[PDB]
Amino acid sequence: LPKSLKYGDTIGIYSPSSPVTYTSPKRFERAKSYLLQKGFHILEGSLTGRYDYYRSGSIQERAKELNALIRNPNVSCIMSTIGGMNSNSLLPYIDYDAFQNNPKIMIGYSDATALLLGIYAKTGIPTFYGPALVPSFGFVDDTYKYFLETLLHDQALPYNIKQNWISVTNGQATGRVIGGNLNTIQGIWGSPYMPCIQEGDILFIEDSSKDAATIERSFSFLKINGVFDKVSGIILGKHEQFDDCGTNRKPYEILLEVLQNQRIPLLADFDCCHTHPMITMPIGVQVKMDATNKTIHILEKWKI
Amino acid sequence: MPLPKSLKYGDTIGIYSPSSPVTYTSPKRFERAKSYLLQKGFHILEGSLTGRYDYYRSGSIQERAKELNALIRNPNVSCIMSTIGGMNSNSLLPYIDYDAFQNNPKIMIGYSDATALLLGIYAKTGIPTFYGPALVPSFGEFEPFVDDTYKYFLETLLHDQALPYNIKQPLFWSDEFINAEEKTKEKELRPNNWISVTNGQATGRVIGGNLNTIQGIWGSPYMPCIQEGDILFIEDSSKDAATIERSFSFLKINGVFDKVSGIILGKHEQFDDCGTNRKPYEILLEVLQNQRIPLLADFDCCHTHPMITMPIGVQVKMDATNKTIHILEKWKI
């Protein structure tokens, strides 16, 4: 397990995909200032302020940027500046051994899913769905409160993960939670960087800014892969800026069609991850979900 | 490897809409495309969802599976062709009558999202399927080089061919683009070239199709396992550099480039380079990190016109250096 975040710690930032520190410099300054005011140090990665159009730099440059943070014993938390699309490119080049030797808090969302799941797959260390620097800290106080509740404060177990969630299909499930951004999962599936989904797992999926056609494809991807024959429950995040194509059907309704009446507890409009504010939550740990009463509890420790 | 019977003049082509409802949204282009093939003497059997509308799709998952299965099970149908793709063909996969197909092999053809079904049917039955025309985009009125697409279609599906069979490079090709003021598309016609990105030769089973669509079936029983020596055929269209980098890295991290003997990359219609002035094959080269796999790019089996009809699941020799692709074994009887 990673060490708990402490006041005054150093948060390392890196840009594994979009060059947001170049394209949104004022929001970037605002976000740094917010965390600095709280007492944290910010170690800016080597691609901060650089621009290569749709990305911050080459595949090798981005892997170097992240590896420098992983190898630095003074960095306690590694946070993406933002996602994008291209984090999966780094996966073959990350120093998993250095991470496993000195586990730290790896946090982000959306495209960062590729790294969160990849590090967990390679090392067994829980990683965290939670804020990215520029979108989340660039309302902010609520996001920060949750960040601290999960990463810094001691928590008695079970740890209730709180947030208008929807009881789509009633029931309860207990198992290891696995998932993240579903579109991003389709860029790592089948590889050594995707943890194997196992019987009894609780599936966490979210997407944002997509359309009904795209999400049907993604849900059917899971179905034809047998995922719904294995998982004990499903937690579906809110889908901000969803384009329903005129159908009037919500994402969960499309999922229900794909499931063809298979009775799996399903809690939807969960507050992760493209929402403001957002929950900070570990992946790869035991959870109990209650879809009927709209609760989620973490059942084992996720930090030291 | 069991094989479909060759297409014959006067055969019945069944059409189905596994995703976008083009027969409802563009009825005129649909009728012109249908007319093109009727005038060639083919019969066109319209699937049950012809003329139906369900927003981004033609009908429910179950309705679409029923539509396709009726064609598969009909002994009068020799060839099954998608009206168009979209995004949602993979939904049908659990529900297709693979047993009926296996025992009455027929020609299954299309492209883009239809990749899900072409690869699924090959995976489950071992019968070659065909990356080639879809009714409305390929034979619709104002599509360019239609007679060349049709000639390629007959060459692969109807005519007997001596082996090895050379897949001839078209002399000319076209893309299409539409501005904000005009209501119909502009088409840019140009001399063709295939690109020897990385010299060499490779012989193996050709497997692939639309890369974006492959990410909707990967890991499932409907994706054929890529084996040592395979030739990877990949195309995408209308994407941006970020999207294709993700797709190429997806293959890389899956070890695909540690397995395949060669790569055939289709043209990328209306690629958005994000201001980089980089071509898709250059992004692929970065991902490959100097692993020097023979690589032939700008192959005409994609969204540009004309379109070659290519069997999937058969042995091919690709010569990237001399820009040739030969099919080495029979794909129809």
Is the Cβ of B254 closer than 8 Å to some Cβ of chain A? yes
Q: Are residues B160 and B170 in the same domain?
A: no
Cα–Cα distance between B105 and B127 in angstroms, integer?
A: 7
Give, as one character, the DSSP assignment of residue B48: T
Q: How far apart are CA B174 and CA A278, in angstroms?
A: 47
Q: Is A35 found in the same domain as A138?
A: yes
B300/B182 same-domain check: yes
The enclosing domain of B145 has a CATH number of 3.40.50.10740
Amino acid (1-letter code) at residue A134? V
User: How many Cβ atoms are within 10 Å of B63's Cβ, its own excluded?
Assistant: 16
Select from B105, B136, B164 the last residue of a domain.
Answer: B164
Q: Could you tell me which of B112, B151, B105, B111 has the C-alpha nearest to residue B128?
A: B105
Tell me the angle at which helices A251-259 and A212-224 cross, rounded to the nearest 10 degrees: 30
B9 and chain A in contact, CB less than 8 A: no
Distance, in Å, from the CA atom of B330 to the CA atom of B32, rounded to the nearest integer, reads: 33
| Residue B256 phi, psi dihedral angles, 5° rounding | -60, -40
C-alpha A279, offset from chain centre: 10
3-state SS assignment for residue B299: strand
Residues 6+ apart with CB under 8 A from B162: none
User: Which among A53, A220, A258 has the least Cβ separation from residue B274?
Assistant: A53
* Phi/psi-derived region of residue A209, left when phi > 0, alpha when psi is between -120 and 50, beta in every other case: left
| B247 part of contact set with chain A, CB < 8 Å | yes
Q: How many CA atoms lie within 13 A of B105 on its CB side?
A: 20
List the domain range (segments joined by +) for residue B95. 1-164
Token pair in block for residue A246: 């005129």
A143 and A188 fall within a common domain: no
> Across the interface, do B91 and A211 touch by the CB < 8 Å criterion?
no
Best CA proximity match to B188, nearest among B198, B206, B171, B175: B175
Q: Are A1 and A76 in contact (CB under 8 A)?
A: no
DSSP string for B245-258: HHHHHHHHHTTGGG
Resolution in A: 1.5
Could you tell me if A258 lies within 8 Å of chain B, comparing CB atoms?
A: yes
Q: How far apart are CA B195 and CA B265, in angstroms?
A: 9
**3-state class (DSSP) for residue B243:** helix
Rounded Cα–Cα distance for residues B319 and B15 (Å): 35
Burial class (CB in 10 A: 0-12, 13-18, 19+), A272: buried
Residues B126 and B171 in one domain: no
CB B6 within 8 Å of CB B158: yes
Rounded to whole angstroms, the Cα distance separating B39 from B234 reads 33
Inter-chain residue contact A186 with B216, CB threshold 8 Å: yes
Picking from B117, B146, B164, the residue at the C-terminal end of a domain is B164
**Three-state SS letters, chain A:** CCCCCCCCCEEEEECCCCCHHHHCHHHHHHHHHHHHHCCCEEEECCCCCCCECCECCCHHHHHHHHHHHHHCCCEEEEEECCCCCCHHHHHHHCCHHHHHHCCCEEEECHHHHHHHHHHHHHHCCCEEECCCHHHHHCCHHHHHHHHHHHHCCCCCCCEECCCCCEEEECCEEEEEEEEEEHHHHCCCCCCCCCCCCCCCCEEEEECCCCEHHHHHHHHHHHHHCCHHHHCCEEEEECCCCCECCCCCCCHHHHHHHHHCCCCCCEEEEECCCCCCCCCCEEECCEEEEECCCCEEEECCCCCC
For B297, the 3-state DSSP assignment is strand
- Looking at the fold, whether A252 and A270 belong to one and the same domain comes out as yes
The C-alpha atoms of residue B268 and residue B254 are separated, in whole angstroms, by 23
CA distance A194 to A204: 14
Taking alpha carbons only, the member of B129, B146, B145 closest to residue B81 is B129
Q: What is the CATH classification number for the domain harbouring A225? A: 3.50.30.60
Cα distance between residue A27 and residue A190, in whole Å: 36
Same domain assignment for residues B145 and B169:
no
Report the residue numbers after which chain A has a gap, meaning the C atom sits over 2.5 angstroms from the next written residue's N, or none. Answer: 138, 163
Q: Which of A254, A134, A130 is nearest to A181 (CA)?
A: A130
Experimental method: X-ray
| B186 and B305 housed in the same domain | yes
Kindly identify which residue of chain B lies nearest to residue A83, measuring between CA atoms: B242
* Strand-strand pairing, A266-270 and A166-169: antiparallel
Secondary structure of B8-43 as H, E, C letters: CCCCEEEEECCCCCHHHHCHHHHHHHHHHHHHCCCE
Q: Sign of the C-alpha dihedral, residues A45, A49, A51, A54?
A: positive
Residues of chain B with C-beta less than 8 angstroms from the C-beta of A58: 286
Q: If you write DSSP's letter for every residue of B99-137 in order, what string do you get?
A: HHHHHS--EEEE-GGGHHHHHHHHHHH---EEE---HHH
CA-closest candidate to residue A118, choices B289, B259, B253: B253
Final residue of a structural domain among A158, A179, A210: A158
Do both B155 and B199 map to the same domain?
no
Pairwise CB contact (< 8 Å): B254 & A190:
yes
Yes or no: say if A280 and A126 are a contact pair by the CB < 8 Å rule.
Answer: no
Nearest one of A35, A118, A115 to A80, comparing CA atoms: A115
Instruction: Please give the tally of structural domains in chain A.
Output: 2
Tell me how far the alpha carbon of residue A105 is from its chain's centroid. 12
Please pick, among A18, A56, A80, A110, the residue that the annotation labels catalytic. A110
Strand B107-110 to strand B77-82: parallel, antiparallel, or no bridges (unpaired)? parallel
A253 to chain B, any CB pair closer than 8 A? The answer is: no
Rounded CA Rg of chain B: 19
Rounded-to-integer distance, Cα A167 and Cα A293, Å: 7
Closest residue by Cα to residue A302 from A126, A162, A123, A117: A126
The DSSP symbol for B330 reads -
B245/A85 Cβ within 8 A: yes
Q: Do A213 and B56 touch (CB under 8 A)?
A: yes
Question: Residue A31's Cα: distance from chain center in Å?
Answer: 19
Residues B147 and B69 in one domain: yes
A245: how many CB neighbours lie within 10 A of its CB? 16
Whether B99 and B78 map to the same domain: the answer is yes
Q: Are residue A168 and residue A154 in the same domain, yes or no? A: no
Closest-CA residue of chain A to B94:
A224
- Cis peptide preceding B18, ω within 30 of 0: no
A137, A131 Cβ separation under 8 angstroms:
yes
One-letter amino acid identity for A4?
S
The backbone torsions φ and ψ at residue B158, rounded to the nearest 5 degrees and listed phi first, read -110, -50
Using CB atoms, pick whichever of B94, B218, B242 lies closest to residue A85: B242
Scan for tokens 């679409």, then name that residue: B64
A97 Cβ contact list (under 8 Å, min separation 6): none
| β-sheet bridge partners, residue B44 | B13
For residue A103, which of A81, A126, A128 has the smallest C-alpha distance? A126
Distance CA A90, CA A184 (A): 14
Residue type, B272: D
State the Cα–Cα distance between residues B238 and B303, nearest whole angstrom: 9
